[PDB]
Amino acid sequence: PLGISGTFNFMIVFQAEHNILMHPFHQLGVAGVFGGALFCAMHGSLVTSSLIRETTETESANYGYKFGQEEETYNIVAAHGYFGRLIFQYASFNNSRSLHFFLAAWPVVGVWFAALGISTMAFNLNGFNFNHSVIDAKGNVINTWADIINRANLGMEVMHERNAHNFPLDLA
């Protein structure tokens, strides 16, 4: 639906019908947007941390940069010097083109997988189903967290569009 609550409706019903959370393409999606946010904040904070002094304390440091200037406005070498020590040297980018390409690629690829998760659950190839996967020596079901998910999903399934189903299986 084109609307805020209707969006959540579409999500909850999608969960009931495809177990999207247990689908690896939605998992890559989450890694893409959580990681896009993480890298956005990381890049922001590293560039901000290494701005070259050009202003006084009574003015915004933003005035230190002029639109179209030729010289870079932060020191990449100090930024890398920082981040390579935070983790270890070889986990930090010293090539701005490489870094920026990574910033483009990580969210874009994850989001392509999110889109493909929706577009392939469209044909009912659904999330992993470990319902009753763990069984004891007698054959008793030993629930896991997958089975608890399953019970939440059942709640959604049995309640959604409460007057629309006449037959026992929801096949589309």
Partner: peptide, 26 residues
């Protein structure tokens, strides 16, 4: 009538929705 069962769902502001509840309904 989103679900074709003659059970119309109100999406618009003037028919009782706020910004969070409102929608253009499928």
């Amino acid at each position: 009538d989103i679900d074709g069962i003659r059970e119309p769902v109100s999406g618009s502001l003037l028919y009782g929705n706020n910004i969070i509840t409102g929608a253009v309904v499928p």
